[PDB]
Amino acid sequence: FIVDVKANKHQIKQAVKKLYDIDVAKVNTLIRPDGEKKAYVRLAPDYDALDVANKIGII
């Protein structure tokens, strides 16, 4: 995901959990050379990423 530079890892985890009613294993955040924060969100093993991406709209 792309998030704003004012978000903690805890905030990103909570936002994903509320929005997409899923579980998050961990979060890794970096700040792109162009300015916004990029977040890699690793889900729980019992949730697969492909179906969540389906529900999102990106396939």
Binding site: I31, R32, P33, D34, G35
Partner: protein, 50 residues
């Protein structure tokens, strides 16, 4: 430098974002006098101050 501060990185990001050329639909508006981007900066020529 690999070690850099947050504000330095943000300023660099803004400067890098500013370096694109103009959109092709600009030059054929009605009240237009712009032919190209005259503020483009190359890393070899001008050294960004700092």
């Amino acid at each position: 430098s690999s070690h850099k501060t947050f504000r330095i990185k943000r300023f660099l990001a803004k400067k890098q974002k500013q370096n694109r050329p103009i959109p092709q639909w600009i030059w054929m508006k009605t009240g237009n006098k712009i032919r190209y981007n005259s503020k483009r900066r190359h890393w070899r020529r001008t050294k960004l101050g700092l």
